Design a protein around this ligand. Structure first.
Ligand SMILES: [Zn+2]
Lengths: 49, 1273, 27, 49, 99, 49, 49, 49, 49
RNA sequence: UAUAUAUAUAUAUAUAUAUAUAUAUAUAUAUAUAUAUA
RNA sequence: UAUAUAUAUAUAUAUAUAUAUAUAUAUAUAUAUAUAUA
């Protein structure tokens, strides 16, 4: 692989690592609440293992 | 040749030009064209006197035995039927009768006649039976004669003109002179003998004359009488004579065809007789070739890549043929001979068989023989009374051998019934398959995307349409007052018009209208019954959406639609070639009448139930396409019935099933018959266009899969067959499209399956289809028939008879067209002769003669003036016809693969450059100041002297008149617009997107000062395009015609001395040709019949490049960025603009505005805009930015690798450094390569390496000017 | 029948023409 | 090219594949005719000498 | 030899496909500012005389009859002796020979 | 006097010239190259009975 | 040789060495079986040295 | 589709004891490829994420 | 709805030593086949029962 | 005029292929006779 | 009247043998034309 392209590829991967996305926070803190509430609403209760 | 002396002086000159004696010029071009338009057509027959025929053909007097027409027609239930003579109920075609007694005399030409005004009046007013029967007979008989692109006599004149003088040889070592000669053609001698009956004082009265309104006939004297069949016989003879000459066949085969036609013409119902013994020729030749001992030769070695879904094939050498590989199926001689005995034509079979036995080994001669003999079938567009056609085709119902018992269904769900689990068999398989697909469709956020919704609604509108009257009645019936826009001059029956009326109305109000009548149409065919066109109304088309969607998913996600993606049709070419190779055994199958066999009682009920059940998984309250959820009564439980909501999709099914159960209600209004419109229902599926192929292909695949995996193993007997039948699946053994299908067996190990097992296998399949009422119509002859393409041992066989030189379909009593359209007919006509491989030299000669006649035309005001015009011959060069001989050159040096448009011009000039420059210097004084490409020698004046500019600009002029607008009609235009926009923009988000994009775009384009006035594709203009199309579909007023002629003449007369800016710049490049490229395949192996050393240029072009499209790294640019687009806009315009912007280095927001202008949301717009790059783009993808495209003629050749690594844009040791493109090469090199390969393809002979040698200006200057032009447009 | 423009040799079958054409024509 | 462009089916079992492939090749007395010809050749040669 | 080769090619499970190699080749990144592209050269050289790819089986079959006939490298494939190692097309030919 | 006579003269006399004003000798030359390549094909792939 | 091209040449050569071809395995393990079987089929037995 | 897969994965958790979400087979790098084949590498990256 | 085989087997019991019911030869999985071929596996199961 | 080479035509001999006629064998169809069954 | 079997006659198809004709290839002889040499 020509290093120039290699330099580019590591660059774009670096950019992805630095995006200030909100999803990881939402998964850890907010999504469980939504599930906990909706579990009492669906016609079929949750069925887990 | 005394015939050459018989020709008038201008025609003698033209013949000399066509023979290559002299360079063609506008002068003689006009003289020939003019004189043809003024002399009576009978003189062409008069020319035949000067041919000393020496052929053994006798025309029996049995032809002139007119059967009385009065017994061939009757009316019952107030409809004029055909009352067949023979007990066969299919004898519904035109009889053999003397039309004479029904003729008056014309005031213009007293000799010929037309129908009595008394007869048509009584049939119209009194509805008198005999009057109506006579009228109907006259109309259809005239129509059958009209099924020609122009008058046959003119074509005969063309053939005589070209054949009047042998062509001059070129200097090429492969330029074989014609082996065939006149005075040996049975066809011409036959024409002579039969025409001897039609002369009274050596005048040779034509039996009929075609006119724009049909055809007229000549009143016979008291002694004689003219049978309509004679006219048809002449057309077939003329067509055969032309074809035989072009295909260069032995006179013996032509003799057989003449006897073939004569025997058919002798009996009654010339059409019916021909139709009965249609398949005789292919069966005698194609189906049975190598059933002998001395078999051998070379054959292609084709391999199918592992991801078979992609349909990728590789040429990988050749295979020696031997006896173990010879075909296994029984020959076809016995049945054909048995049939021929009926018409006492056994001699034809004996002649054909004996001649065939002279080709025991597979080579060029064998396939060439096969091509020629198969070219003998009649090329007539058969036409019958539409009333009989509709009555004969839709009167069929499938016969099911094991119907689903009524006890196999559950309780109703309002309309549908679910299938009980306990039921097994093919029906269960079908039910599960559709149900599974319905489930996948059920949850799919791909829909409810507003853009996708726009696509579906827009897909429903086209310029054509029908059933508008039924629509207006049904809605008016329910109290719905639709708008009208008549002042906007657009046809009411157009699907556009009805769509505009619907835009405002709430959809559910329209539900009652889906159960309304549907009009119908008929399109004639060459070798079969006429096809049917059944356009639904827009509402019905909308309701049936779930059926289409599920079918699409079944296709695209099971057997990848079996090529029904139709991306390029050429993907079937390598497929059949591979399927016909010796190692593989192939079987051709097709449903007898899939349209007539799909029905509700068995099929549609199962599908409706499966779809309705399959949609149960999903929100019960979720409207779809404006159809809300509703409450339906569930009665599955007799003890606990109730009602529950159902989603909109299910509501659609509820109505759709109701409609299917009720059956389609058609209304026939045939014009050829007289006053006999009526309506009758049928279960026949509409199947009017490609929208039906999806459903039939899905069911086709499903039944086949169940047969292979379940039914056959459980039922077949041969253990060996079971062993090979297993380990076989449709995804790698079967393909189909609609009714048509191909089944290929796994490679039997160095061997072939016993014909005994084949018979067992084929028999069981027939019974399997018989179970649910499908006649499978299978055959096994070790050949490949798929989508009307024929392959034998990996060599493609063009079935030329399906493209008759003279024949052309016309579905209405009137041609309804204007003179300039004939030019496009000529262009399309010529291309077929290239697609099909004919003798390229002779075909070119005939083509120019056709062009010369077409070059001239006129028109007359309904009351007032006349108008006239004609083109300089250089137009046709620009349109894509190679010149035969330029001044200073040698004839026949330009190949038919010469590209049309600017590319063809550039290549011609590039070769012609040096002679022009030097000659101009001697002949003319120098121009006053230096020129970029020319020296001071001033060639442009010379080109004007040749009228090149006139032709170059004339071809640019439009050829169909334009309708005029009006202001109160513009209120309707706005009303039409508003409603079309309203129908298009059902929601608001799309409208906001487009408006923002347009506003930003013009703001950027002006402020950044890229340019102004750039017509960028945008949704706001889609309704405008629709409106223009709708108005264009109307018959133009005469004033528009007068404007056309005046404008055209002015464009011709205006003295201009410049081409388009692109062509001007293109001339700055110098290209040279090196040695021949390394060969693709062995020249011994035939790949296309007729592309042999005899037909050298085709043989060269195919051999060098190889036919199999094998773009392993190019992909021919099919990866367009915008996969999803709305109708009306052009993808090829969109990507061209995007690349042009990218080359211009526009800021990203420019791309954002453009993308947002076609509905793309900002997020995806950024996503799309980022993908745009000069690297991933393909050569053709980027080269199209300046309209440099690949000619259609090249689509059958493997041009990819050549363009990639054989067109050197910069060879270090040859190119001048001035031409070094430097950094801009990233987008400059593809352009140069395209120009180079275009020039290389232009010249005749083998393909050579193409090299740029010099640009007169610096490459930098060229790039700069190109960037300017790119910015300008 | 078929013929070669360089030497006027005439051939009954095209295969014979091909093999001849390719092999017989090339101080 | 043949050396570098060799590939097969994903989960090939050679014994099975060859089992199907060779099945038709051992169905007849073809191999034995040459044995019979060899014997006759032997007798003919000796007698001639 | 021909009989065995054709018979052999019928039963084998091996399949040849030049495409996989070309993809591996073309995926190589390179600059567009160079006067010569090795990629184009080797691709041009890589395609056989015809699109034949049959010599491989011919070599296999010959082994069963090496007493009768011997395969030999085609004489025309050798690099020209007058060239030098820096002449890339000659260099590639040498590589194919030793392989 | 005739294009035929001129064409025959061009093929015969100027059989090896390279003047741009003439086309046909070059094409014939290319055809000769075409044949030589054709020899290269069967020379390593002959035809068996 | 300019190093950029030189870098390219070693790159493409490396790519060839990394292709996961099947042929070498087939030669060592499967081809001998095919020969051994076919040796009993051809009209002419093998003739080796 | 506004990324139905994401919400689909979340919903599946509530009924993991009944249904399991799996990565689609097509969304895999072909086993015949090398690490240097960029599209294959990106695919593997997405699978890991 | 015939089930002739079932009754045939029962009847044959009273006449063993005169007629013997045997499993259909073609009902067996092919010998060359492998266990991984599911249709063959089912045959073996039914054969066992 | 003679000799050599090339092409064409005729005659003779040999070999292959096709067609026709005659003889023998096999298969199919039709007609007649006998036998059996319905 | 129908079906099956056997025998006889006629026609068609296939194979083998003999005769005749045509075409192709090879060899020999003769004639004609063209080129070269004396
Ligand atoms: Zn020649």
């Amino acid at each position: 692989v020509n290093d120039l392209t290699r330099r580019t590829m590591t660059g774009v991967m670096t950019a992805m690592r630095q995006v200030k996305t909100m999803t990881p926070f939402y998964i850890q803190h907010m999504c469980p609440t939504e599930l906990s509430v909706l579990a009492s609403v669906t016609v079929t209760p949750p069925f887990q293992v | 040749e005394e015939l050459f002396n018989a020709l008038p002086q201008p025609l003698q000159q033209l013949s000399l030009a066509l023979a290559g004696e002299i360079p063609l010029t506008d002068h003689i071009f006009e003289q020939a064209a003019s004189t043809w338009h003024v002399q009576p057509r009978s003189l062409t027959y008069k020319l035949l006197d000067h041919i000393p025929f020496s052929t053994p053909v006798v025309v029996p007097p049995s032809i002139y035995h007119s059967l009385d027409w009065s017994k061939c027609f009757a009316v019952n239930q107030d409809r004029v039927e055909r009352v067949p003579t023979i007990d066969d109920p299919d004898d519904v075609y035109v009889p053999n009768s003397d039309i004479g007694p029904l003729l008056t005399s014309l005031h213009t030409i007293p000799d010929y006649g037309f129908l009595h005004p008394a007869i048509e009046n009584d049939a119209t007013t009194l509805r008198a039976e005999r009057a109506r029967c006579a009228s109907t007979f006259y109309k259809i008989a005239s129509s059958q004669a009209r099924q020609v692109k122009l008058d046959p006599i003119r074509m005969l004149g063309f053939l005589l003109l070209v054949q009047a003088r042998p062509r001059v040889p070129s200097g090429l070592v492969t330029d074989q002179p014609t082996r065939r000669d006149p005075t040996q053609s049975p066809a011409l001698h036959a024409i002579w003998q039969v025409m001897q009956y039609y002369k009274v004082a050596g005048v040779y009265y034509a039996p009929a004359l075609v006119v724009p309104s049909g055809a007229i006939w000549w009143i016979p004297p008291p002694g004689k009488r003219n049978v309509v069949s004679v006219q048809y016989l002449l057309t077939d003879l003329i067509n055969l004579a032309i074809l035989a000459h072009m295909t260069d066949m032995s006179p013996t085969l032509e003799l057989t065809g003449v006897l073939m036609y004569l025997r058919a013409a002798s009996s009654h119902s010339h059409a019916y007789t021909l139709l009965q013994m249609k398949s005789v020729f292919p069966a005698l030749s194609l189906r049975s070739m190598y059933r002998n001992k001395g078999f051998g030769g070379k054959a292609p070695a084709i391999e199918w890549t592992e991801p078979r879904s992609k349909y990728k094939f590789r040429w990988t050498g050749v295979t020696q043929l031997h006896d173990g590989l010879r075909p296994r199926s029984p020959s076809m001689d016995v049945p054909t001979l048995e049939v021929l005995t009926k018409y006492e034509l056994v001699d034809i079979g004996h002649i054909i068989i004996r001649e065939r036995n002279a080709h025991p080994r597979h080579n060029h001669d064998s396939v060439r023989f096969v091509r020629d003999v198969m070219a003998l079938t009649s090329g007539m567009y058969l036409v019958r009374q539409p009333t009989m056609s509709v009555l004969r085709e839709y009167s069929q119902v499938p016969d099911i051998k094991d119907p689903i018992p009524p006890s196999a269904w559950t309780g109703p769900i309002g309309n549908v019934r679910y299938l009980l689990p306990s039921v097994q068999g093919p029906a269960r398989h079908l039910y599960d398959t559709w149900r599974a697909a319905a489930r996948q469709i059920a949850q799919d956020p791909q829909w409810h995307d507003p853009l996708n919704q726009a696509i579906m609604r827009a897909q429903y509108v086209t310029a054509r349409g029908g059933s508008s009257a039924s629509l207006k009645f049904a809605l008016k019936v329910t109290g719905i007052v639709l708008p009208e826009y008549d002042d906007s001059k657009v046809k009411k029956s157009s699907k556009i018009y009805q769509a505009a009326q619907i835009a405002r109305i709430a959809f559910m109000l329209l539900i009652a209208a889906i159960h309304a009548e549907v009009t119908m149409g008929i399109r004639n065919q060459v070798q079969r019954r006429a096809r049917s066109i059944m356009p639904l109304n827009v509402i019905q088309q909308a309701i049936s959406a779930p059926h289409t969607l599920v079918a699409n998913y079944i296709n695209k996600h099971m057997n990848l639609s079996t090529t029904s993606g139709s991306v390029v049709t050429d993907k079937v070419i390598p497929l059949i070639l591979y399927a016909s190779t010796p190692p593989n055994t192939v079987v051709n199958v097709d449903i007898k009448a899939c349209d007539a066999s799909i029905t509700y009682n068995y099929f549609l009920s199962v599908i409706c139930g499966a779809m309705h059940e399959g949609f149960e998984v999903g929100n019960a309250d979720a409207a779809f396409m404006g159809v809300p959820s509703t409450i339906v009564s569930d009665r599955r439980s007799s003890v606990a019935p109730y009602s529950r909501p159902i989603s909109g999709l299910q509501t659609m099914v509820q109505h759709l099933a109701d409609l299917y159960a009720a059956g389609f209600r058609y209304s026939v209004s045939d014009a050829f018959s007289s006053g006999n419109k009526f309506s009758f229902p049928t279960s026949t599926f509409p199947s009017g266009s490609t929208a039906t192929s999806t459903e039939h292909t899905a069911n086709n695949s499903t039944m086949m899969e169940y047969f292979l995996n379940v039914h056959a193993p459980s039922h077949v007997k041969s253990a060996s067959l079971k062993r090979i039948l297993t380990d076989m699946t449709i995804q790698r053994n079967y393909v189909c499209q609609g009714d048509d299908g191909i089944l290929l067996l796994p490679h039997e190990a160095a061997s072939k399956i016993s014909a005994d097992d084949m018979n067992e296998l084929l028999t069981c399949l027939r019974d399997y289809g018989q179970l649910f009422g499908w006649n499978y119509d299978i055959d096994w002859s070790d050949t490949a028939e798929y989508l009307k393409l024929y392959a034998l041992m990996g060599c493609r066989i063009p079935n030329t008879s399906r493209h008759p030189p003279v024949g052309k379909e016309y579905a209405a009593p009137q041609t309804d067209e204007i003179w300039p359209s004939l030019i496009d007919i000529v262009i399309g006509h010529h291309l077929n002769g290239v697609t099909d491989v004919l003798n390229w030299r002779e075909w070119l000669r005939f083509s120019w003669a056709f062009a010369c006649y077409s070059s001239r035309g006129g028109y007359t005001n309904p009351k007032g003036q006349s108008f006239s015009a004609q083109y300089p011959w250089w137009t046709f060069v620009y349109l894509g016809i190679p010149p035969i001989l330029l001044p200073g050159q040698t004839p026949f040096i330009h190949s038919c693969y010469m590209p049309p448009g600017d590319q063809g011009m550039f290549s011609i000039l590039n070769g012609w450059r040096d002679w022009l420059i030097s000659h101009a210097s001697t002949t003319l004084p120098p121009l006053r100041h230096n020129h970029p490409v020319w020296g001071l020698s001033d060639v442009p004046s010379l080109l004007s002297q040749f009228g090149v500019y006139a032709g170059y600009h004339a071809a640019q002029h439009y050829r169909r008149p334009k309708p005029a607008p009006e202001t109160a009609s513009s209120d309707s235009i706005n009303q039409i617009t508003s409603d079309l926009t309203e129908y298009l923009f059902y929601d608001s988000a799309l409208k906001a997107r487009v408006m923002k994009g347009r506003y930003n775009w013009e703001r950027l384009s002006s402020s950044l000062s890229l340019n102004v006035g750039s017509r960028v594709p945008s949704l706001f203009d889609v309704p405008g395009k629709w409106v223009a199309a709708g108005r264009d579909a109307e018959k133009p007023p005469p004033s528009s015609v007068e404007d056309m002629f005046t404008s055209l003449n002015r464009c011709i007369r205006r003295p201009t001395h410049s081409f388009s800016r692109l062509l001007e710049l293109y001339l700055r490049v110098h290209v040279t040709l090196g040695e021949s490229i390394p060969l693709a395949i062995d020249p011994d192996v035939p790949q296309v019949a007729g592309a042999d050393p005899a037909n050298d240029d085709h043989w060269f072009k195919y051999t060098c490049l190889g036919d199999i499209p094998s773009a392993t790294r190019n992909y021919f640019g099919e990866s367009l960025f915008v996969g999803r687009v709305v109708s009306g806009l052009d993808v090829e315009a969109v990507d061209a603009t995007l690349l042009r912007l990218k080359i211009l280095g526009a800021p990203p927001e420019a791309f954002i505005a453009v993308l947002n202008g076609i509905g793309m949301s900002d997020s995806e717009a950024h996503q799309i805009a980022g993908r745009i790059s000069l690297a991933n783009a393909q050569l053709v993808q980027i080269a199209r930015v300046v309209h440099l495209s690949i000619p259609s003629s090249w689509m059958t050749l493997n041009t990819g690798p050549y363009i990639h690594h054989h067109a050197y844009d910069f060879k270090p040791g040859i190119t001048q450094p001035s031409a070094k493109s430097r950094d801009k090469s990233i987008w400059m090199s593809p352009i140069l390569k395209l120009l180079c390969t275009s020039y290389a393809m232009t010249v005749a002979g083998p393909v050579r390496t193409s090299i740029v040698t010099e640009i007169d200006g610096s490459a930098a200057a060229l790039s700069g000017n190109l960037r300017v032009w790119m910015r300008d447009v | 029948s078929y013929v070669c423009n360089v030497c006027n040799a005439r051939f009954s079958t095209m295969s014979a023409l091909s093999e001849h054409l390719r092999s017989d024509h090339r101080s | 090219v043949a050396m570098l462009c060799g590939q097969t089916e994903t989960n090939l079992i050679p014994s099975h594949h060859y089992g199907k492939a060779f099945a038709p090749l051992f169905a007849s007395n073809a191999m034995f005719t040459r044995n019979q010809r060899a014997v006759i050749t032997r007798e003919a040669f000796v007698c001639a000498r | 030899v021909e009989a065995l080769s054709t018979l052999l090619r019928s039963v084998t499970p091996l399949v040849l496909d030049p495409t996989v190699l070309t993809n591996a080749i073309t995926t190589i990144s390179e600059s567009t500012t160079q006067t010569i592209s090795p990629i184009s050269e080797i691709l041009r050289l890589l395609q056989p005389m015809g699109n034949d790819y049959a010599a491989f089986w011919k070599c296999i079959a010959s082994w069963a009859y090496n007493g009768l006939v011997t395969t030999v490298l085609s004489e025309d494939a050798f690099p020209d002796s007058s060239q030098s190692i820096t002449h890339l097309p000659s260099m590639w030919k040498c590589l194919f020979l030793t392989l | 006097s005739t294009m035929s006579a001129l064409s025959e003269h061009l093929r015969s006399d100027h059989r090896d010239d390279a003047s741009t004003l003439l086309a046909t000798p070059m094409i014939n030359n290319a055809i000769r190259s075409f044949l030589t390549a054709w020899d290269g094909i069967r020379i390593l792939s002959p035809d068996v009975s």
